Structures are given as C-alpha cells and as structure tokens.
Amino acid sequence: DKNESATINEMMKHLGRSEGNPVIGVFQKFLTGHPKGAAGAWMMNGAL
Amino acid sequence: NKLFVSKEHAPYTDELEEDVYLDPLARVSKDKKSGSLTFNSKNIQSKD
C-alpha cells in the first residue's frame, strides 16, 4: 500500500498533474479480500 | 566455472531509480571509477 501510493504519486508528479487535484483511491479488497490471479479482473469490473 | 555471475547491484543507485524509470532516453555509460555500466545523473533528463 505504501509502494503503490508512492509509484502512483510519482506518475502524477512527473506528468505535472495539478497541485490540489489528487487521484481518488478505491481499495476494493477491503470488501472482497485478495483472490490472487482474479484480483485485477474484479478491480477492472469495478472501474467500468 | 563463471559463465554465470550474479549482479550485486542494479545499473542505477536507489537515489536515481525513479529518475531513470521516468526518462525514456536515459542510457548507461562506463563508470570511469568502477569500470562497470551505470546510470550517471549527467545523462538523465539531458538536453544531449
């Protein structure tokens, strides 16, 4: 959660995302838990 | 018995890791001191 936060934050910082316009995090695994392989397919379904 | 020699270090220091990841033109040069191929800050986000 720290590594991920840091890498997203640095992606935005480098591409000059506006100060005061943070991305809004969703953490779907709070509800579902972590199904290994399927983890990202559930996140995609949620994104859609 | 040395066809395989494991690397102790990435070609970037931890300090330069993100900088190298974020400059697509960043290439490695022969470190004068060590003789091994490393990323110099001189060649990262470099007008040249």
Q: Which of A41, A24, A22, A23 is nearest to A32 (CA)?
A: A41
Angstroms from B18 CA to nearest CA on chain A: 8
In sign, the C-alpha dihedral spanning B38, A3, A20, A43 is positive
CB B4 within 8 A of CB B28: no
Q: How many CB atoms lie within 10 A of CB B26?
A: 19
Angstroms from A39 CA to nearest CA on chain B: 26
What's the reported resolution, in angstroms, to a tenth? 2.8
Q: Cα–Cα distance between A46 and A19 in angstroms, integer?
A: 27
Q: How many CB atoms lie within 10 A of CB B39?
A: 21
> What experiment produced this structure?
X-ray
Q: Which of B11, B44, B9, B10 is nearest to B30 (CA)?
A: B11
